[PDB]
Amino acid sequence: RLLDELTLEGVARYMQSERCRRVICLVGAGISTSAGIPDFRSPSTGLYDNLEKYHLPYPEAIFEISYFKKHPEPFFALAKELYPGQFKPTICHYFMRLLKDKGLLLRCYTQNIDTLERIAGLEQEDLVEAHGTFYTSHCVSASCRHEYPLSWMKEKIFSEVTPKCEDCQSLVKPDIVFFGESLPARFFSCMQSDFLKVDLLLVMGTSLQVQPFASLISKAPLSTPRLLINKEKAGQSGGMDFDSKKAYRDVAWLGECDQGCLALAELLGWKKELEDLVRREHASIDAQS
C-alpha cells in the first residue's frame, strides 16, 4: 500500500513524498454550496427538493435537453431565481489553486458550471469542465451556433424574455451539458493519459451518481490512493472501499469540503498559504465589484 494509514494525515504524508507528483481532482456541486450555489441531492436545500412550483414531470426534466427544447421557460425561471449576487470561489477551489501553484495538479475534472474554478485561477489546460459552463451560450441550431455572452444571457434571464437567436430565431442555451447531451471531446482526450499517470485522486463535493463522470474513480491504477472529502460517503459499490477488511487506499473525510481542505492544507504545511490566498483573492473580487 502507498498510504501508511487510512487518514487525512496519512494522505498528507503521501502527498509530501516523492511518489505523489500527479494529483487529479474530481469535484461536484458540494464544493460550491458554501459559495451560495445549492447542490442537487441535499434534503430541503437541494434543487431537487425545490421544483414543485415549476410543475415538472420529474425533477430532472428541468435539466434534460429534450424537455428544455420543448419547454425552456422553467429552466430560465430557475436560473433567474438562482443567479448568484457574487461569484466568490471557496477555500476548496483555492486549495486546488494551491495544488496548481505547487505543480501537483495534473487536472481538475469538474461537474460544476459556475466557473469558480476559473475565477480561483485554474487555467483552461488545468480543467476538464466535464459538463460545460454557464459563462458562454449558443444558439441550439447546429448550422448556426451563434455565440452569446453571459451579459446577453443574464439580461434575457432577468427581463424574463426567453433567449432567442437573432439570426434564426432558435432557442439560445447556456453551454451546460444537459442530461441527454454528450460530454465534450476534451473529457475523453484527457482521461486517456490522465488516469494512467495519476498518483492521487481527490474527490470532493460529489455524490458520484451521474455517469460517465462517476466512473472516473475506477480509471485510476489500483495502487493510486483516493481521498473523499464530502458530507457523506460516496462511490461505494472498482468502487470505493473505506471500511472493509481489504481497505488499503481509500480514505473518507466526512464533513464540509472547506473544513477538510483547511485540515489537509494544515497537515501539509500550507495553512497560512491557503489563508493568504483566500484573503487576497476575495479582496481582489470585492475590489473589482
Binding site: 459538463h131 444537459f178 442530461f179 454528450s182 451521474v210
Partner: peptide, 8 residues
C-alpha cells in the same frame, strides 16, 4: 452515433 451522454 455520439459520445457518451450525461445520465443520472
Amino acid at each position: 452515433e455520439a459520445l457518451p451522454k450525461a445520465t443520472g
